[PDB]
Amino acid sequence: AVASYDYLVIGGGSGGLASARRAAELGARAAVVESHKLGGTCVNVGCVPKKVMWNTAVHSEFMHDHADYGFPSCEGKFNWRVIKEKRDAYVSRLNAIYQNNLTKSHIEIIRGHAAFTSDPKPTIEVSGKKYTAPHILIATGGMPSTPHESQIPGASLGITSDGFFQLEELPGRSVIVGAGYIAVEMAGILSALGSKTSLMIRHDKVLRSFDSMISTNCTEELENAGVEVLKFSQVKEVKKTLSGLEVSMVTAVPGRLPVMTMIPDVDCLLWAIGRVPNTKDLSLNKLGIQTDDKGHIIVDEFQNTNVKGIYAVGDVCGKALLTPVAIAAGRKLAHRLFEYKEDSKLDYNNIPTVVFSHPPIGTVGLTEDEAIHKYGIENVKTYSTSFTPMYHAVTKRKTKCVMKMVCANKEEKVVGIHMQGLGCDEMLQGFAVAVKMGATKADFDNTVAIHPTSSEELVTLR
C-alpha cells in the first residue's frame, strides 16, 4: 500500500523544512521525513548552539576589558555546565517551534529513515511503509569528516563538531585540526573560555579560500588571542594515555627539515576537516540517481537530479554549505514546482557569509585574485583600510579592523567586499544587497556615512 503526496521531502533540516513550508503555502499536499531531530544541523549541532557559545566567548573576551572601562575586575572561573544547560534548553525550544511550524502548515511528519525503492515510479520506504509523489526532494545534509584509522591510527579518539555539543566540561587542553570555518570558530571559542588551545593547520594560514587579506589577518588574530597556531603540521597518530590523549605530529615547513613532535596531555582532539554528504543509505542506485565520488547528489541550476521528479538542495549537493543557501534554494524550488515559475532558481553568485571568529569576518563576492583572473589585472582596482576600532581607545587589549573593496572595469563595479573586525557580523547584510544590485564605488561614495561607527569606513575608502 502506497500513500501519495504532491511533495515528499527527505530531511527536516533547513532546506527541507523551508521547501516543504513554501510548497504547502501554494497548496501542495506535503510530507517531511526525519530520522532524528527537526531543525537538522542548524538547530541541533550547528548555527544556533555555535552562536550561543560564540556569544559566551565574546562576552568573556570583552570582560577582560572591564577594569579598563572603570569597573573592579571580574576574576572568577567560567562554568561550562551552566551555559551548556541553557544552550540545550534553547535547542529544545526550537525543536518544539519547528514541529509546530509543520503542524500549522498541515505538513505530515514521517518519523524514520527513508530510502528509495526500485519502483520505476519514484517511491520511498520508511519503517516498512511506502510513500510516493511526482516531486521528491532529497535534503539530507552532511556529517563531519574524520580520518580513517588506516591513515591515522587512533583518529577515532578525536571528536568532531557533533561531539563538541555533547561536551559537559571545558577541556583543559584542546588540539583543533583543520583550517576552515569550524577549526577557526571552535579554536576561538575554546581558547576564549580558558582551554589551552592549539590549532594544527597544513599550511601557513587559515581560511586559504578567502581573500588573502582575510587569510592573513585571521591567522594573526588567532595568534594574538592566545591560540597556538601549529603551521605546516599534520597528525600522524593518536594514543590514549593516563593523562588524556598523546597526539603525534609531523611539521614540515618549507626550507626546513621535517620534524616529529608529541603533544601530551590533550583532553580534546577535534577534527574540523570538512563534511561529507549523508547519502550512503538512501539506495540511490535503485533509481540511477547520479552522485560524485564523494557521494554528493549531482544537480543542475534548478536543483534537478538526473532523474525526473527528483530534486536535491542544501549540504547534500556540496555547493555553498550555508543555512540560508539551503533555505533559498528550497524556496525557489517550491515556487518553480508549485507556482509554475519556470525561471525560479537560486543565483549562487554574491552569497554573503560570516565567520564567527574574534573579531568576526564578513565577505561577499570575489576575492582580489578571483577578480584579476576574471576581468584582467589592468581592469581591477582595490581599495582597503586597516584601523583599531575606537572601542579599544581605552583598553590594553587590542583587535584590528581590516576592510577591502574589489572593483572591476572603468565604472568600478563592486565585485567583492572583505572585512574582519568588531561589528562585521551585523554589518555585511546591507552591503550584500548593494553588491547584488550591481553597486559601483560611486554608489558607495554617494551614501552619507554614519558616525562614529566602523561601518562608515566602507563608504569613505579612497
Ligand X SMILES: NC(=O)C1=CN([C@@H]2O[C@H](COP(=O)(O)OP(=O)(O)OC[C@H]3O[C@@H](n4cnc5c(N)ncnc54)[C@H](OP(=O)(O)O)[C@@H]3O)[C@@H](O)[C@H]2O)C=CC1
Ligand Y SMILES: Cc1cc2nc3c(=O)[nH]c(=O)nc-3n(C[C@H](O)[C@H](O)[C@H](O)COP(=O)(O)OP(=O)(O)OC[C@H]3O[C@@H](n4cnc5c(N)ncnc54)[C@H](O)[C@@H]3O)c2cc1C
106 counts as catalytic: no
Is residue 230 part of the contact set for ligand X (CB under 6 A)? no
DSSP 299-348: --TT-B-SSTTEEE-GGGG-SS--HHHHHHHHHHHHHHHHS--TT-----
Maximum CA extent, the chain: 72
Is residue 14 part of the contact set for ligand Y (CB under 6 A)? yes
Residue 369: which of ligand Y, its own copies, ligand X, none does it interact with, CB under 5 to 8 A by kind?
Answer: none
Q: What does the radius of gyration of the chain's CA atoms come to, in whole angstroms?
A: 24
Query: Is 314 marked within a binding site?
Result: no
Residue 177: which of ligand Y, ligand X, its own copies, none does it interact with, CB under 5 to 8 A by kind?
Answer: ligand X
Please state, as a whole number, how many other Cβ atoms lie within 10 Å of the Cβ of residue 49: 21
Is residue 50 part of the contact set for ligand Y (CB under 6 A)? yes
Instruction: Order across the sheet with 196-200: list the strands.
Output: 228-230, 196-200, 173-177, 268-271
Show contacts with ligand X in window 341-370 (CB under 6 A).
353-356
DSSP 231-267: TTEEEEEEEEETTEEEEEEEE--TTS--EEEEEEEES
On whether the CB atoms of residues 434 and 424 are closer than 8 A, the answer is no
Nearer to its own copies, 410 or 462 (CB): 462
Nearer to ligand X, 123 or 217 (CB): 217
Is residue 31 part of the contact set for ligand Y (CB under 6 A)? no
Q: What are 379's three cell numbers?
A: 581592469
3-class state of residue 353 by DSSP: strand
Nearer to ligand X, 130 or 319 (CB): 319
Nearer to ligand X, 73 or 453 (CB): 453
Window of 39-47, 84-92, 101-109, 261-269 that interacts with ligand Y by CB under 6 A: 39-47
Cα–Cα dist 445/447, whole Å: 5
Cα–Cα dist 362/336, whole Å: 31
Is residue 185 part of the contact set for ligand X (CB under 6 A)? yes
Query: Is 208 marked within a binding site?
Result: yes
Show contacts with ligand X in window 207-226 (CB under 6 A).
208
Window of 126-134, 168-176, 272-280, 434-442 that interacts with ligand X by CB under 6 A: 272-280
Is residue 319 part of the contact set for ligand Y (CB under 6 A)? no
Residue 416: which of ligand Y, its own copies, ligand X, none does it interact with, CB under 5 to 8 A by kind?
Answer: none
DSSP 157-194: GSB-HHHHTT--S--SEEEEE-SSHHHHHHHHHHHHTT
Cα–Cα dist 90/57, whole Å: 18
Window of 150-158, 202-210, 323-331, 378-386 that interacts with ligand Y by CB under 6 A: 323-331
**Helix 47-63 and helix 80-104: axis angle, to 10°?**
150
Query: Is 21 marked within a binding site?
Result: yes
Nearer to its own copies, 4 or 79 (CB): 79
Query: Please, what is the minimum distance in Å from the beta carbon of residue 307 to ligand Y?
Result: 16
Query: Is 393 marked within a binding site?
Result: no
Cα–Cα dist 389/397, whole Å: 12
Is residue 272 part of the contact set for ligand X (CB under 6 A)? yes
Pairing, β 142-144 against β 275-277: antiparallel
Q: What are 323's three cell numbers?
A: 543555512
Query: Please, what is the minimum distance in Å from the beta carbon of residue 359 to ligand Y?
Result: 15
Window of 108-116, 172-180, 280-288, 401-409 that interacts with ligand X by CB under 6 A: 172-180
Is residue 318 part of the contact set for ligand Y (CB under 6 A)? no
On whether the CB atoms of residues 412 and 422 are closer than 8 A, the answer is no
Q: Find out whether the peptide bond into 264 is cis, omega within 30 degrees of 0.
A: no
Query: Please, what is the minimum distance in Å from the beta carbon of residue 210 to its own copies?
Result: 15
Q: Which residue is nearest to ligand X (CB)?
A: 180
Query: Please, what is the minimum distance in Å from the beta carbon of residue 265 to ligand X?
Result: 22
Q: Quick one: CA dihedral 313, 314, 319, 320, positive or negative?
A: positive
Q: Tell me which of 83, 250, 273, 298 binds ligand X, using CB under 6 A.
A: 273
Cα–Cα dist 92/23, whole Å: 26
Is residue 317 part of the contact set for ligand X (CB under 6 A)? no
What does the binding site for ligand Y look like in residue numbers (CB under 6 A)?
Answer: 10-16, 33-36, 40-42, 46-47, 50, 113-114, 139-141, 161, 182, 278, 282, 314-316, 321-324, 326, 451-452
| Residue positions forming the annotated binding site for FAD | 14-15, 34, 41-42, 50, 114, 315, 323, 451
What does the binding site for ligand X look like in residue numbers (CB under 6 A)?
Answer: 177-183, 185, 201-203, 208, 272-275, 321-322, 353-356
Question: What positions carry a catalytic annotation?
Answer: 451
